[PDB]
Amino acid sequence: MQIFVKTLTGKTITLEVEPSDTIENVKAKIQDKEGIPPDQQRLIFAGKQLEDGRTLSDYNIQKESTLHLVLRLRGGMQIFVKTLTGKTITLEVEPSDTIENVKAKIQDKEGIPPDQQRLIFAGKQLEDGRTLSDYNIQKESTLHLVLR
């Protein structure tokens, strides 16, 4: 009950768990430390993919047992952001994602700091505190960035 996972880069991370948790429970924990969205991560062992739900006991996983992680390209849910220039960029997000969570990811692509950013969704201004759910932003939706 102290296992690691490894990306195909070599980058290893130790994950404090017990031989009871489910596959998604592990995935849940990964996002805790690393911040990697659960649905964007697949997990492998003994040469085979693991399915959410079935507990890690079943798949013969032991202590210091080396697990294999793979990051997908998609993420299940996506939204769009239009820049002051007219550019459209696709963000990978989840319902429970604050405006700071969104502002974060926008900084990665476009670059621009999270303080030049003021997001206008259907007329009204967005605010760092409230998540995507509060404003009720379904996938495929398109945000707008304008001058602060």
Binding site: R42, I44, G47, Q49, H68, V70, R72, L73, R74, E140
Partner: protein, 85 residues
């Protein structure tokens, strides 16, 4: 017999050689085994990239239709405006 002793040790030595070979081999096999582990996961990755592609192709398709309809919906409202005042 001068020669008997000779053969026995000539064999004993050839024997040690082989044992050192297997030790060397067993040592590479150990290296080979943690590396091999990386193959199934390079496949499991090729796969979820393909599915990621498809789920992306799709959304594109759904996007192709939604713009097709909009184009017509717009053309309509235009015929109807021109026949108006």
């Amino acid at each position: 017999l001068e020669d008997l002793r000779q053969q026995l040790q000539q064999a004993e030595e050839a024997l040690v050689a082989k044992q050192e070979l297997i030790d060397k081999l067993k040592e590479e096999a150990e290296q080979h085994k943690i590396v091999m582990e990386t193959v199934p996961v390079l496949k499991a990755q090729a796969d979820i990239y393909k599915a990621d592609f498809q789920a992306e192709r799709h959304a594109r398709e759904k996007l192709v239709e939604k713009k097709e309809y909009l184009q017509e919906q717009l053309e309509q409202l235009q015929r109807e405006f021109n026949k108006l005042k």
